[PDB]
Each structure stands twice: as C-alpha cells, then as structure tokens.
C-alpha cells in the first residue's frame, strides 16, 4: 500500500506539498505516481498530474509535481479555497498490480473526452453484472483503459486494467477470480464483468484512460475519468 498523509492545512495563498511513498519499481528501475483530485466521494476525481510531473492542460498552473529517488511530491503554489479535496496517490505495487491508490489526503483550506459508464444499478447478491463505458473524444485504440470503484465514503480502489491491444489484463485483490475486463476497440467500448456479487462490490464504478504513450495502464498515469456508475449489491 502507498503512503501519504492523511490530512494537510493550508492558509489561502500559502504553499502546499503532499507526498506519496511506497510505489513499486517500475521495468525502467525508475518510479512513477499519479495525483487525482476528488471533491466530494462518488464524483469523478480530476487527475492534476500524472507521471510524476504532467500537467493537463485545463489545470491550473499552480499545480505541480515532482518526484525524488521512489518519493513523488504535489506541490500547490498559491492554494485556494476551491482547491479543497481529498487528493489520491496512484501508482503501480507490483508487476502483477499495476495500480494501487492511497488512503488519500484531505486538504483543507483554511476559513472534451467523454467516459460514459452503464450497466449499474441494483444488483443480486451472488448474481453477476455487467458495466460498459463507451469512450469518446479520443483514439480509443492507442490507450490503456481502467476500471476503479469507490465504496460509499470510502477511498478509490483499482478494479482491474487493459491494454490497448487486450493483453497485459490483471484485477484488484478484492476481485481476482471474479472479474473480467475486455474492450472493442471498434466499438470505443471497455467492459467489466464482475461476478458472485456481495454487499462489499457496492460503490461507484468509474472508467478511467490512461495516457501512456505505448498503450499500457498504471497507477500514475490516468488521465481522465468518467462521471462513473452506481452499484447496488442487495437484496
């Protein structure tokens, strides 16, 4: 599991750093996180960085990222009261998990692309589901797809990933032997199916892009996300 603190307080104009430990080596030897922004839980997280210093370019310059040896640090030059939230670390734990995501830190302050999820609503315990997120706004076909679900008040947990080309597929602990992720790239569409559902599957279930230029999926590298899909496991 990643580590970064829990909570940081911050004056209006002050200066901010948030940093993230415990990600995996990378292939490269080298080491590589992710910052997600959410507001409140259940709503798309914002990435403000991602591959340890990128920057979208709708985020506001204030925002930056560096990373030291296997440490990545977020740095918010001039905070505002707007930039209150709960920031996620991302990163890889392990060649066979590519996407693990922090406890979050909760920020106060002191005083395009379109991911669509389906495929959610109740659901019977023990049954199966199945999530489609039709993608659009970019080329489908170059990218690493995500899937990443949020248990009511809870932090983001990875669900599984694909690559561009379907190979390279690997599943969250909590779902390994359970789950399947597939995509078409004709279609734009990536696909989660989860099976033998219990209460503990409840949650929002986002989709999510990855911007790695070789078509991969990590922790530290998605780019954007969908407004996600509730799920309801009861009976």
């Known amino acids: 599991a990643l580590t970064q603190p829990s909570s940081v307080s911050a004056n209006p104009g002050g200066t901010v750093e948030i940093t993230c430990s415990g990600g995996?080596?990378?292939?490269?030897?080298?080491?590589?996180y992710g910052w997600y922004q959410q507001k409140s839980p259940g709503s798309a997280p914002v990435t403000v960085i991602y591959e340890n210093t990128k920057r979208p370019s709708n985020i506001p310059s204030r925002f930056s990222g560096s990373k030291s040896g296997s440490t990545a640090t977020l740095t918010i030059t001039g905070v505002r009261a707007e930039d209150e939230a709960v920031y996620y670390c991302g990163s890889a734990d392990d060649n066979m998990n590519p996407t693990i995501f922090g406890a979050g830190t909760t920020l106060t302050v002191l005083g395009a692309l379109t991911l669509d999820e389906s495929g959610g609503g109740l659901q019977t315990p023990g049954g199966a589901l199945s999530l489609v997120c039709k993608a659009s706004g970019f080329t489908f076909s170059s990218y690493g797809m995500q899937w990443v679900r949020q248990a009511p008040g809870k932090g983001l947990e990875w669900v599984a990933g694909?690559?561009?080309?379907?190979?390279?597929?690997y599943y969250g602990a909590a779902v390994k032997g359970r789950a399947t992720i597939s995509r078409d790239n004709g279609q734009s569409t990536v696909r989660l199916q989860l099976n033998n559902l219990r209460a503990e599957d409840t949650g929002t279930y986002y989709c999510?892009?990855?911007?790695?230029?070789?078509?991969?999926?990590?922790?530290?590298?998605?780019?954007?996300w969908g407004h996600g899909t509730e799920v309801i496991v009861s009976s």
């Open positions: 694909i690559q561009n080309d379907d190979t390279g597929t």
């Open positions: 995996g080596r990378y292939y490269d030897g080298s080491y590589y």
């Open positions: 999510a892009k990855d911007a790695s230029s070789d078509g991969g999926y990590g922790g530290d590298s998605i780019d954007a």
